[PDB]
Design an enzyme around this catalytic site. Structure first.
Site, PDB file in Angstrom:
ATOM      1  N   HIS A 120       4.673  11.783  -6.180  1.00  0.00           N
ATOM      2  CA  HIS A 120       3.797  11.239  -6.615  1.00  0.00           C
ATOM      3  C   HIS A 120       3.733   9.938  -6.530  1.00  0.00           C
ATOM      4  O   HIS A 120       4.553   8.364  -6.210  1.00  0.00           O
ATOM      5  CB  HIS A 120       3.445  11.550  -8.586  1.00  0.00           C
ATOM      6  CG  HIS A 120       5.245  10.757  -9.293  1.00  0.00           C
ATOM      7  ND1 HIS A 120       6.007  11.409  -9.113  1.00  0.00           N
ATOM      8  CD2 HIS A 120       5.415  10.105  -9.528  1.00  0.00           C
ATOM      9  CE1 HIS A 120       7.421  11.357  -9.634  1.00  0.00           C
ATOM     10  NE2 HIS A 120       6.565  10.346 -10.407  1.00  0.00           N
TER      11      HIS A 120
ATOM     12  N   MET B  36      10.913  15.486 -21.807  1.00  0.00           N
ATOM     13  CA  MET B  36      10.376  13.907 -21.658  1.00  0.00           C
ATOM     14  C   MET B  36       8.866  13.751 -22.518  1.00  0.00           C
ATOM     15  O   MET B  36       7.888  13.949 -21.668  1.00  0.00           O
ATOM     16  CB  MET B  36       9.967  13.835 -20.877  1.00  0.00           C
ATOM     17  CG  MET B  36      11.870  14.187 -19.522  1.00  0.00           C
ATOM     18  SD  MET B  36      13.266  12.389 -20.385  1.00  0.00           S
ATOM     19  CE  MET B  36      14.168  14.165 -20.152  1.00  0.00           C
TER      20      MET B  36
ATOM     21  N   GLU C  30      -4.323   3.305   0.234  1.00  0.00           N
ATOM     22  CA  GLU C  30      -5.056   3.767   0.922  1.00  0.00           C
ATOM     23  C   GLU C  30      -5.219   4.997   1.038  1.00  0.00           C
ATOM     24  O   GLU C  30      -4.927   5.918   1.203  1.00  0.00           O
ATOM     25  CB  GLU C  30      -4.154   2.895   2.277  1.00  0.00           C
ATOM     26  CG  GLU C  30      -4.903   3.721   3.754  1.00  0.00           C
ATOM     27  CD  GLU C  30      -4.321   3.154   5.655  1.00  0.00           C
ATOM     28  OE1 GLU C  30      -2.850   2.300   4.256  1.00  0.00           O
ATOM     29  OE2 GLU C  30      -4.354   3.471   6.235  1.00  0.00           O
TER      30      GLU C  30
ATOM     31  N   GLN D 248       0.703  -1.506  -0.069  1.00  0.00           N
ATOM     32  CA  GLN D 248      -0.190   0.495   0.024  1.00  0.00           C
ATOM     33  C   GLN D 248       0.827   1.275  -0.490  1.00  0.00           C
ATOM     34  O   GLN D 248       1.784   1.029   0.017  1.00  0.00           O
ATOM     35  CB  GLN D 248      -1.241   0.216   1.281  1.00  0.00           C
ATOM     36  CG  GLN D 248       0.345  -0.245   2.707  1.00  0.00           C
ATOM     37  CD  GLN D 248      -1.162   0.031   3.621  1.00  0.00           C
ATOM     38  OE1 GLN D 248      -0.855   1.287   3.771  1.00  0.00           O
ATOM     39  NE2 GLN D 248      -1.892  -0.790   3.895  1.00  0.00           N
TER      40      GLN D 248
ATOM     41  N   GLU E  24       1.624   9.989 -11.969  1.00  0.00           N
ATOM     42  CA  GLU E  24       2.263   9.951 -13.236  1.00  0.00           C
ATOM     43  C   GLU E  24       1.907   8.954 -14.964  1.00  0.00           C
ATOM     44  O   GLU E  24       0.825   8.169 -13.945  1.00  0.00           O
ATOM     45  CB  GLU E  24       3.740   9.969 -13.054  1.00  0.00           C
ATOM     46  CG  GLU E  24       4.731   9.474 -14.496  1.00  0.00           C
ATOM     47  CD  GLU E  24       5.717   8.729 -13.948  1.00  0.00           C
ATOM     48  OE1 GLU E  24       6.630   8.704 -14.943  1.00  0.00           O
ATOM     49  OE2 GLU E  24       6.181   9.126 -13.205  1.00  0.00           O
TER      50      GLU E  24
HETATM   51 ZN   LIG Z   1       7.815   8.896 -11.530  1.00  0.00          ZN
HETATM   52 ZN   LIG Z   2      -1.482   2.260   6.045  1.00  0.00          ZN
END
Ligand SMILES: [Zn+2]
Ligand SMILES: [Zn+2]
Ligand SMILES: FC(F)(F)Oc1ccc(NC(=S)N2CCc3c([nH]c4ccccc34)C2)cc1
Lengths: 179, 177
Positions: free
Chosen positions: B120, B151, B93, B27, B166
């Site tokens: 991210h 990019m 989560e 998670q 992303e």
């Molecule tokens: Zn990344």
């Molecule tokens: Zn947790």
């Protein structure tokens, strides 16, 4: 009236079935900035058992990326292009971002998201046994945020990585117990 | 400066201890202001499935677990469902602290401005350009369009809390590097 959380009914009603265009999507990474890849790599590989999939360097931009994941190192393609397409198609990788020079700066550190201003909370690792995992963690000098039997939620731990990010340590087959 | 050499980096890597053999990365937790906007964003826009919902009235918070999983795979009976959820790789989560949704002076920090830390989450997709086309069509907010910047072929969008996500194609990153 004021909050009491959503009932299952309200919660479940906000949930859509996946659109067919999203059927091959996967949650590939969580990115965290790290001060010193020497400390972080040692921690994530030796303490937690993850594998370094790939290291990517971007000299013009002065950063490197380290991708860690629970994968067999013998599964990693040797060729840089096939390695890259493999790494970025694995589930559940950690992208650790090293901005060059932070390791030498003794006044620089990253924020773990758990004090003002809050946001990100932690990553979490499922293990077969929290207590034996944490005994080993303790023997290796790992810093704990929450020992397994400390606090309300018994049988569940939080440790910190070398940057101070919190890592939950949990047993999926006993979480049912601790409400 | 100049970064770690491969030799320095690789020399800091240990082989895994056998006691870690069954560990999995299960998670990433993010705090969310409004579970209504978020479940809608993650299920409908991104295509994740809500595995489970947990409430802690005594502490006034709820946890929402999302993952790319077939819902028909979810155990029906409430107990074994939990052990399934917490044994899936790569779940999100989402933590809702009750009342933040009604508050206009509150927002969470996305980790990308001072003080930085978390950056991210990232989603691998078969075609970045069509994904983002669909995203544009649903009104998704972008941080970086796929052709924006050096990019090319790689995107960043924002969730309802402002967290960056992303969007990438594993077969085109090799070109992009
Ligand atoms: Zn990344
Ligand atoms: Zn947790
Ligand atoms: F200075 C440090 F410590 F490195 O802190 C950071 C923190 C975040 C980033 N990343 C940023 S700011 N962005 C990602 C990509 C991107 C932004 N605007 C754009 C316009 C056009 C094309 C791409 C972009 C924004 C870069 C450096």
């Amino acid at each position: 009236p004021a909050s009491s959380g959503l009932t299952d009914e309200t919660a479940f009603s906000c949930c859509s079935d996946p659109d067919p265009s999203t059927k091959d999507f996967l949650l590939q990474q969580t990115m965290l900035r790290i001060k010193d890849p020497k400390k972080s790599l040692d921690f994530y590989t030796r303490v937690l058992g993850l594998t370094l999939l790939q290291k990517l360097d971007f000299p013009a931009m002065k950063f490197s990326l380290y991708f860690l994941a629970y994968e067999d190192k013998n599964d990693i393609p040797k060729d840089k292009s096939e390695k890259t397409a493999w790494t970025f198609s694995r589930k559940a990788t950690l992208e650790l971002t090293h901005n060059w020079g932070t390791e030498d700066d003794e006044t620089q550190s990253y924020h773990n998201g758990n004090s003002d201003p809050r946001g990100f909370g932690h990553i979490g690792i499922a293990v077969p046994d929290v207590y034996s995992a944490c005994k080993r963690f303790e023997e290796l000098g790992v810093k704990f945020v929450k020992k397994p039997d400390d606090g309300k939620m018994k049988g569940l731990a939080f440790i910190q990585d070398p940057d101070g990010y919190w890592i939950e340590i949990l047993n999926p087959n006993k979480i049912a117990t601790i409400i």
